[PDB]
RNA sequence: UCCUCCUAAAGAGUAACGGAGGAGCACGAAGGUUGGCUAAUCCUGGUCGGACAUCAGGAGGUUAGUGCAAUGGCAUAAGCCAGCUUGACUGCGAGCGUGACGGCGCGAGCAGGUGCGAAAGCAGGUCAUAGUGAUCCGGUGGUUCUGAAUGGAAGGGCCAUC
């Protein structure tokens, strides 16, 4: 059989052109009165996967 | 009642005398101000120094206090 | 002591404007005879000074050390800055309290053309 | 029964007796009791060296101590495992270096001061010499 | 933490708001700093709300 | 879990059921700026008043203070007082520090619009280092971005926040 795809993984990484993966920061979510405005504005933007866990990311969407 | 500690805050002279930088770049990581900024250095809301403009880094000694002062020299 | 007050008083000011690194216009004022000096960025050398004390000034005005005097002085050095090119300056208080004769000779100088 | 009061902190690191004695010249008496080697010395062996001398002396002249314990050293409890914690404090000792100075003492005779010496040294731990107060 | 969080909301249309904390034992009337509106572009005054 | 010192061997880091202590905040001011000021402890005189209230003078130079434990720092004061204020602002951000990663920290400078000062200038919270919790699910406000025949709506997305 083909392979499955991670679902939950489809949902948070996007592949870009030179094979890299973008994904949104991970502490944009709730308890946001307590963080200065330049932690929260630094967050917005998307992020590039780093190298160390982009082996795993490979595995999770062979397809996308 | 013993066994807690804080992890370490890896402070200490990142740049050190005679080696250009890049404006920006952090020399000094310090709680107070062991050393005070000179020319062409600026000085961080937590005491930590770094360049303002492209150069070499030197340290030197000034004031009635002997103080120890960082600059940056175009070179 | 006055002179201990008056140089802590100015040493914040001073400190700045020595890193900043520009010329500055430094006032001194005592009961007769207000100063007046303009000093490069580094601080070694006089651009040029004026003052009531040398007679080429002092042969007008009735009294030195009033606000007259501190407009003759604050224009003087007008005159001779704008001579000399230097036109920015910054002006440095010396610990004087920016109101009576300071103030005085500011307002004529920067009329003059010395803004600042 | 030597022993600090108010003590900064109950415990202390081991350390080491590495190095070489400070004061080794005789500078309140005239006779001194000088350590030739290394070790460290309780207070116990302080107190009965000192108690042998003021009555070998019969309470004549003047004593002087110039070590003091200054390091408290613990012992762990019989049958306690390994861990738990540092052990408490039992006893204080002074660290001796060779060329320190232990006691010194003045106003009697050379003769009878080679003596009381002799049976002070008989109850400490460390190899001792007598000295006597050089000019200068 | 005694001290809860309020809402600051601009006194002009726009929906914008900012978030803080207030203590309500000390200091119990309304907050009415004057801050900047990005929607609005300007400095108008906020009123403290839930 | 987090913070400070030592262990830790003069860069960084470095273990133990090793030795000492703290935090799960507080503050619309204790923030910003402008102006001004400089302690602790002692000696002498003086009603209650007394070793220790307040006043005057002298030695002293920071042993004081710094909202909170400790370390480092602080006279240009970061310490103390007063006026005016909301920069505890929005969109960014060269370049660096720190982490396996998630992430965390510092930051000149540019645009917009503000506060203090005559002005140069300073201000993107607090002398710094603890005061904190990923994702999922769901709530509230804004935004035709989308909205499965069409026009809407529901529901999603994006932004702010719980």
Not at chain 1, 47 to 61: E, F, Q, R, T, Y
Not at chain 2, 21 to 35: E, M, N, P
Not at chain 4, 39 to 50: D, F, K, M, P, V
Request: aromatic share 6%.
């Amino acid at each position: 059989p083909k392979i499955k795809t991670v679902r939950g993984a489809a949902k948070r990484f996007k592949k870009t052109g030179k094979g890299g993966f973008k994904h949104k920061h991970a502490n944009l979510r709730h308890i946001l009165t307590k963080k200065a405005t330049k932690r929260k504005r630094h967050l917005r933007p998307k992020a590039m996967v780093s190298k160390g866990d982009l082996g795993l990311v490979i595995a999770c969407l062979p397809y996308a | 009642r013993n066994g807690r500690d804080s992890e370490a805050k890896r402070l200490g002279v990142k740049r050190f005398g005679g080696e250009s930088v890049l404006a920006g770049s952090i020399i000094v990581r310090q709680r107070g101000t062991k050393f005070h900024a000179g020319a062409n250095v600026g000085c961080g809301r937590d005491h930590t120094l770094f360049a303002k403009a492209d150069g070499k880094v030197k340290f030197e000694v000034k004031g009635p206090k002997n103080r120890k002062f960082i600059s940056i020299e175009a070179e | 002591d006055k002179k201990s007050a008056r140089i802590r008083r100015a040493t914040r000011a001073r400190r700045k404007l020595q890193e900043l690194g520009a010329t500055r216009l430094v006032v001194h004022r005592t009961p007769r005879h207000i100063y007046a000096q303009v000093i490069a960025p580094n601080g070694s050398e006089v651009l040029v000074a004026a003052s009531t004390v040398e007679k080429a000034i002092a042969e007008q005005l009735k009294y030195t050390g009033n606000k007259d005097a501190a407009a003759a002085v604050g224009k003087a050095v007008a005159e001779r800055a704008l001579e000399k090119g230097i036109k920015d300056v910054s002006f440095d208080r010396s610990g004087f309290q920016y109101h009576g004769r300071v103030q005085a000779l500011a307002d004529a100088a920067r009329e003059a053309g010395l803004q600042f | 029964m030597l022993q600090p009061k108010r003590t900064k902190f109950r415990k202390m690191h081991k350390g080491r007796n590495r190095g070489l004695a400070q004061g080794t010249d005789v500078s309140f008496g005239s006779f001194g009791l000088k350590a030739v080697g290394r070790g460290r010395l309780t207070a116990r062996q302080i107190e009965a060296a000192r108690r042998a001398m003021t009555r070998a002396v019969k309470r004549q002249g003047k004593i002087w101590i110039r070590v003091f314990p200054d390091k408290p050293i613990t012992e762990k409890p019989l049958a306690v495992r390994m861990g738990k914690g540092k052990g408490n404090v039992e006893y204080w000792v002074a660290l001796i270096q060779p060329g320190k100075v232990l006691y010194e003492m003045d106003g009697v005779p050379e003769e009878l001061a080679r003596e009381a010496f002799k049976l002070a040294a008989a109850k400490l731990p460390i190899k001792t010499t007598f000295v006597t107060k050089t000019v200068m | 933490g005694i001290r809860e969080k309020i809402k600051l909301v601009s006194s002009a249309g726009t929906g914008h708001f900012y978030t803080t904390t207030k203590n309500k034992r000390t200091k119990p009337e309304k907050l009415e700093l004057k801050k900047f509106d990005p929607v609005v572009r300007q400095h108008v005054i906020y009123k403290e709300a839930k």
